[PDB]
Each structure stands twice: as C-alpha cells, then as structure tokens.
C-alpha cells in the first residue's frame, strides 16, 4: 500500500513541580509531527505555532467560554487526575534485582568484562557504581543506559572492563529511591 | 517532577484512532475503540481508578473531523515515512530452562502502522505474545513494545521482524543464547 497517509495528533499535557504546588497545562495539536497551535496555561490563550494554526488560534480565542475552561484545567484536569492515580504512579516504588556475571569483549579471549544487570526497578532514576577491593573504579565503565521495558519497570546493564586477578573482590553498588541504603553485590575471581 | 499526557491521534486513510494516558513515559491505560473499554496497562490500576471510555470516543470523533480540516489547509501534504529503530532484549538475565521474556522495542517511527512478527527458528510464533499500543514520543514520533515469553535453550534462535512503509526490506533483529 503506497497511498499517502495523513495524521492528526493531540496532546494534553500536565506538568507538576513540587507535587501539585506549581502546575502547568499545555493543549497541543499536531499535523503529522508539526505542532501548529497550542494553549499554554502560562499565557492563558491559544497561540499559533506555525502558519497552519492561525485560523484555530483566532477562532478558539474568540470563544470566552472555551478559554476559561482551559484556564481552569490546571485545577479541574491536571490536579484532579494527579490525585486519581497518585498512589500507583507518583508513589510507585519497585526495588531492582542486581545480578553480576562475567563476559568477553572478544569471543575467544578470557573473561574481561563484568556485567552488573539491574532489572525491574521503578522509577528510572538510578546510580550504579563499580568497586574493586573497596576502591571505586571509574575507568572502563560502559552501560546500555536506562532501558524502559514498557511495563512500568526499567533495567540497565553497567559493564566494567577489567582483567580479574585471583583474590580480587568486585562489588556493584546500586542506589535507587526505593532503597534506604546502597544495594551491593560482590563477585570473586 | 512529573508529566501526565493525554495523547490522541487519528490516521487516514486507515481510519485508525487511539487514546491513552501517559505518566513519565509509561502508559496508564488506553481505550479499545472497538470494545469501547478502558484497558489498564497493569491490572492493579483498574482497582484504584476508573475511566469512562465514552469520553475517548468523542475526542476521536473530533480529531477525525479536524484531520479532514487540516488536510485541506495543508493542501493535502501527506506525512513522510520515518522508519523505525528496532531492539531485541530480555527483561532479565538469561538462564537455561529458566523462563524469561523477549522484548522487541520499536522506536522513532511514523505513521503509527507496523507489522510485527516473532520468529523461532524462522517460523512465526503466536503463543503467549503480547504488545502495547503505539506510544507517544516527545519528538511526536511513536514507539511500541512486543513481548514473547520463552524458555531459553541452545536449540532455538529468535528474530523480531518489523515491516514499516519507511523500510525497503523487512527489518529483522536477532537473538540467540
């Protein structure tokens, strides 16, 4: 099918700062991927983002009833929906499972790669650190970055390039808002 | 701190519409337009909150009418296909005979139309697979997840096959133990 496609998108956005203290609402309309008109609660009326949206800005701004409906959205819509799901969204805390296993940088060489798999945590903010004999190793660290599993859990791999010597102890240390003290897992050669 | 987005789209000539709520990049729920039902991303969500799906269907009707209006304004300028980037991964470290899940992450594409197939040893797999709706991005492209629970074994190889109008050939992303 080579027929041309045409796409309309709308995004109603609620931005929260310090809980529901400061809230900002954006009513955004899109043609394909181009935003053409938006309502910013900081401004109080619609503004054309491109020339394609000027007829909507003028027309919608002439409807005083619609405008005050949008100007109250930070209360009637943003703050309301925040309170509806706060218990299982804002306060959702899942602690990660931390696995450590070796790998190879070259398929025939020796194990020169320590993988710290950090799986199933929420929210995404996390800090992973590598240590060798109680000393933090900041060189040779590669990661996948933060990976979103799409099911309200995150994961990440933090890998340390090193040549393990016998007797060395490596520990991967994880900090996450669901923990009250760092989570450490050791690996011995 | 936090961002909640009510994202909607309507697509011609496919006549596909969608409606969903996003929290910090995760889906809270979407509305099945056919069943006119609220579909919670996690079953727990449906026990603490509710949503009447009729409000979603009314918005989709307006978006349909607006799209015809905006198509005229643009002088019928169609969308440009943006092919996706596909990643295959497991949600936990892989152990033999220990059940796991394969995740196919399809990212940064538009329009939101895609044909996704799981393949085990080159053959299509349908048992136990699941998927998400099209998820919104801040650059206003889309992303999507497909899942395949599986028992890891050295006897099997897997591929996620993704076809998109922005791709010449189907995109195959491989995985093996």
């Amino acid at each position: 099918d080579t027929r041309p496609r045409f796409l309309e998108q709308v995004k109603h956005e609620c931005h929260f700062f310090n809980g529901t203290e400061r809230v900002r609402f954006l009513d955004r309309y899109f043609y394909h991927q181009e935003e053409y008109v938006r309502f910013d609660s900081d401004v109080g009326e619609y503004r054309a983002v491109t020339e394609l949206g000027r007829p909507d800005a003028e027309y919608w701004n002439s409807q005083k009833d619609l405008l005050e409906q949008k100007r109250a959205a930070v209360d009637t819509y943003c703050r309301h929906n925040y309170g509806v799901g706060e218990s299982f969204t804002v306060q959702r805390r899942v602690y990660p499972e931390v696995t450590v296993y070796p790998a190879k940088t070259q398929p025939l060489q020796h194990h020169n790669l320590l993988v710290c798999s950090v799986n199933g945590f929420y929210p995404g903010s996390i800090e992973v650190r590598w240590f060798r004999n109680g000393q933090e190793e900041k060189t040779g660290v590669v990661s996948t970055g933060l990976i979103q599993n799409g099911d309200w859990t995150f994961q990440t791999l933090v890998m340390l390039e090193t040549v393990p010597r016998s007797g060395e102890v490596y520990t991967c240390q994880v900090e996450h808002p669901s923990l009250t003290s760092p989570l450490t897992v050791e690996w011995r050669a | 701190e936090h961002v909640i987005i009510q994202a909607e789209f309507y697509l011609n000539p496919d006549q596909s519409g969608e409606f969903m709520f996003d929290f910090d990049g995760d889906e809270i729920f979407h509305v099945d337009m056919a069943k006119k039902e609220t579909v919670w991303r996690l079953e727990e969500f449906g026990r603490f909150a509710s949503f009447e799906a009729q409000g979603a269907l009314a918005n989709i009707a307006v978006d349909k009418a607006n799209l015809e209006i905006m198509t005229k304004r643009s002088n019928y300028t169609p969308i440009t296909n943006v092919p996706p980037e596909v990643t295959v991964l497991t949600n936990s470290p892989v152990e033999l005979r220990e059940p796991n899940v394969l995740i196919c992450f399809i990212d940064k594409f538009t329009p939101p139309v895609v044909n996704v197939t799981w393949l085990r040893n080159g053959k299509p797999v349908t048992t136990g697979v699941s998927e998400t709706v099209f998820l919104p991005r801040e650059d206003h492209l889309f992303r999507k997840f497909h899942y395949l629970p599986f028992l890891p074994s050295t006897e099997d190889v897997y591929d996620c096959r993704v076809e998109h109008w922005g791709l010449d050939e189907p995109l195959l992303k491989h995985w093996e133990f």
């Binding site: 027309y59 | 009314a58 307006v62």
Partner: peptide, 13 residues
C-alpha cells in the same frame, strides 16, 4: 477516583 478527559476542540473551517 475517576480520570477526566480534556476535550478536543473542533477546528475552524
């Protein structure tokens, strides 16, 4: 706790 949908607005014709 019921979620509220922010209504779409019909464009100018």
């Amino acid at each position: 706790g019921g979620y509220r949908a922010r209504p779409a607005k019909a464009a100018a014709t």
